[PDB]
């Protein structure tokens, strides 16, 4: 529903946004 | 490029979240 | 450490982030 | 309020998070 729906595409978005992050981090730590 | 790039995008993703967001306090205050 | 570090700090705003989204799913959720 | 507060902290989390997002990057670009 609307911010059920605004929610589900935020913790979505978060979780490829921690994915993101992890890469950076590690292509760092090589 | 894998660290500087992972973290363009997670900036971007991290933009659409906090966009979603902000609908969400806005469908929220209804 | 500027950048090394900026990382980790931001993981971790990410992970309060994703959890208090976690909660307000199911408050909502009611 | 309950959802209002968790949405508010995740808002605000998220913000620190693209501030320290930045700082990385720009160490980078250093």
Do not use: F, P, V, W
Request: net charge negative.
């Amino acid at each position: 529903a609307e911010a059920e729906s605004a929610l589900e595409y935020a913790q979505q978005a978060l979780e490829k946004a921690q994915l993101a992050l992890q890469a950076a981090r590690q292509a760092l730590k090589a």
